[PDB]
């Protein structure tokens, strides 16, 4: 048995920004009290990982990053009720702990416990479960699915359907359930509405489903990589649009096409300019825009406030605005009932020890989602 | 009789940026089609007609300001429907036309028939009312109301109580409807919550009214003037709060009150610096934040975006969020019912002769409403 021991496992760690990940024998500590300690068995790579090795997101390096994975629990620390040994589990980069004054709001979602907000790059009892070489590395959002083992805090997982096709439902982990709570339960999209999703990765596209489930008539898909334009449409974009293609500023090209302004926006990219253009293009008396993407760490954009006096909503979410624990285990039962597709997000398949070529795909255009298999 | 004839009344005429207005003899020429000439009776000193003189709002000078007020029929042109002559009426800085896609949609007031967005200046028509020493003078927001006569189109202005005091619900015009209305309709603060209101002029206290009528628990009411303070608590503030008092930035002050950020702010001043810090003040995850102060002119603000991120919102509007023609007679309706007070906000009445002197004392700190009277 491995209860109890430290586990010797192949992970993904990154020493430095802008350089490759190392695949290679890290350390793995057994589980402390309210610790779960999981052998991961599917990993998409996400944006946001690719964030931390270029410093758009700053967070504590050597690191073991991932955030979107499932897999199945190895063992459990004294004290962990919500799963057992052989579950399938989805790791949750933002906790749920179900105490802070957070988790008791009936609209809030961002635990007091998250690691996001400051991130230290530990568990939450502000140690390492990692060894490398002989050092310590960090965790990433208290979760680190980039290894064949991972510990996390009992707060950061939720138990999921036995029967779950694991390969898929990773995408629930982040950016599936982000891009549609972004449209279904944020934004609040309304039926016969114009939407425009700004980014058309597999977190915009998620939003499109959401806007699509939520009835939407218009759904303007914007982005400057036209490759991306045929899944948008068909995953329920109505029409697409590049701004490289027009001498006026988009949101002047989106206020024109929606007759004044469009109902809801979405800012599915991470740029500081698009953020205030996706606020702009929203009808200025009861438009509502939504910022999804991750802006570059500590910088600020400067927009005019008569956007909002006019009447438009602003606001942003992580996580599609899902309570983690709570919602996590519903989108898979949901998917599980055919509720919503998450095929068309998966454009590529590679086995973890390909990673970096995963990391390529992203960067280059190519991909949606690669998942990264076990 | 005066219907259909000019009329030669006094008025406040505004020749030129930061100069006193000028007291004299204006022509009003006779009401067109879909038009209304009121006999004003009281008018109210908003910051937002101290904004036209001070340079913080661009609109065409010379100029009638004044938009807060209440008056009688004079005279209607062909083909009104709604008022006749002898009603009580206030007239409606933000219009309601009834026809275009904001007033049909069950959130928007911000009427596209407005003057605010890109002020001209007019009727309606493009054509001015009013001249004074053989030159025209333009219109403010399509009210003028800064003078004995004024002209307005039948959808900036709305029928009232007969037996309404206009000495007193002329307030409904701006300020008062303002800023209850950023608190039950825009930001729907909630029972039990806690509130912060940066500015306790007329307007801020209005919105302390709104809160406490909402049942927030704690009003924390901001201003750098202490002697703002005593008329705060007396409309329900449960505390108030200088920002010269600490050595700390505000907002973390009131993120330390109360116990990680309040539930909802307001800015109900006018400065971009305030605007982010009331934003910042609410908590993360679920606050909202309402921006009801006018900044100066084509300033922008500086903020970043991490705080909408988390989850927070971040709101506008013009008027409380009201549809100007429906509501006014609802509110005033209100008010004779005893619904909410109107006589906390009237600190000095005087006559219009003495417009200047009304403006001064709001300048110096020394009143919240002066109400003028013709
Ligand atoms: N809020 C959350 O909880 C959350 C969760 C998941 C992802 N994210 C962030 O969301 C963003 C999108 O993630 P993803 O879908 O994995 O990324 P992605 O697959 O890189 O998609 C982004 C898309 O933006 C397009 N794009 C780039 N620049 C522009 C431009 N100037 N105008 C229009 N389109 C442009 C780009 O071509 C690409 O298709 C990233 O910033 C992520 O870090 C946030
Ligand atoms: N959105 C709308 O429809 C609408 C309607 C009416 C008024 N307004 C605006 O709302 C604002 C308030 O109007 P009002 O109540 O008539 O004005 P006011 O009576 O001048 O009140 C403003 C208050 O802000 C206080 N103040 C000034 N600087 C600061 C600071 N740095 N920190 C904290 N307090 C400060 C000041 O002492 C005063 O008590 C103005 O900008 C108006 O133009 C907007
Ligand atoms: O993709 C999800 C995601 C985020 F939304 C963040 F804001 C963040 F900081 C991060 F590390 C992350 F992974
Ligand atoms: O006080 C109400 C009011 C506003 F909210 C404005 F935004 C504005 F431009 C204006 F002229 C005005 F009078
Ligand atoms: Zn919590
Ligand atoms: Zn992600
Ligand atoms: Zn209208
Ligand atoms: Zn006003």
Chains 1, 2 share one sequence.
Request: hydrophobic share 40%; with cysteine.
């Amino acid at each position: 048995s491995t209860a109890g021991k430290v586990i010797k496992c192949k992970a993904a760690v990154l020493w430095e920004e802008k350089k490759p990940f190392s695949i290679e024998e890290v350390e793995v500590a057994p589980p402390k009290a309210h610790e779960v300690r999981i052998k991961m068995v599917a990993t998409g790579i996400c944006r946001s990982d690719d964030h931390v090795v270029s410093g758009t997101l700053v967070t504590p390096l050597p690191v073991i990053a991932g955030h979107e994975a499932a897999g199945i629990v190895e063992s459990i620390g004294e004290g962990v009720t919500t799963v057992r040994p052989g579950d399938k589990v989805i790791p949750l980069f933002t906790p749920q702990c179900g105490k802070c004054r957070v988790c008791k709001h009936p609209e809030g979602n961002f635990c007091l416990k998250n690691d996001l907000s400051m991130p230290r790059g530990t568990m939450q009892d502000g140690t390492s479960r990692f060894t490398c070489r002989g050092k310590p590395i960090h965790h990433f959002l208290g979760t680190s699915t980039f290894s064949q083992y991972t510990v996390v805090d009992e707060i950061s997982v939720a138990k999921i359907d036995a029967a779950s096709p694991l390969e898929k439902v990773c995408l629930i982990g982040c950016g599936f359930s982000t891009g549609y709570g972004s449209a279904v339960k944020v934004a609040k999209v309304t039926q016969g509405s114009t939407c425009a999703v700004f980014g058309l990765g597999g977190v915009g596209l998620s939003a499109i489903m959401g806007c699509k489930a939520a009835g939407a008539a218009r759904i303007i898909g914007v982005d400057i990589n036209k490759d991306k334009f045929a899944k948008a449409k068909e995953v329920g974009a109505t029409e697409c649009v590049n701004p490289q293609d027009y001498k006026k500023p988009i949101q002047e090209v989106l206020t024109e096409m929606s007759n004044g302004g469009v109902d809801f926006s979405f800012e599915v990219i991470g740029r500081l300019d698009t953020m205030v253009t996706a606020l702009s293009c929203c009808q200025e008396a009861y438009g509502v825009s939504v910022i999804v993407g991750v802006p570059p760490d500590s910088q600020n954009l400067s927009m005019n406030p008569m956007l909002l006096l006019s009447g438009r909503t602003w606001k942003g979410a992580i996580f599609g605005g899902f309570k983690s624990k709570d919602s996590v285990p519903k989108l898979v039962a949901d998917f599980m009932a055919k509720k919503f597709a998450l095929d068309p997000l998966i454009t590529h398949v590679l086995p973890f020890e390909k990673i970096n070529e995963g990391f390529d795909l992203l960067r280059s255009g190519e991909s949606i989602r690669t998942i990264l298999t076990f």
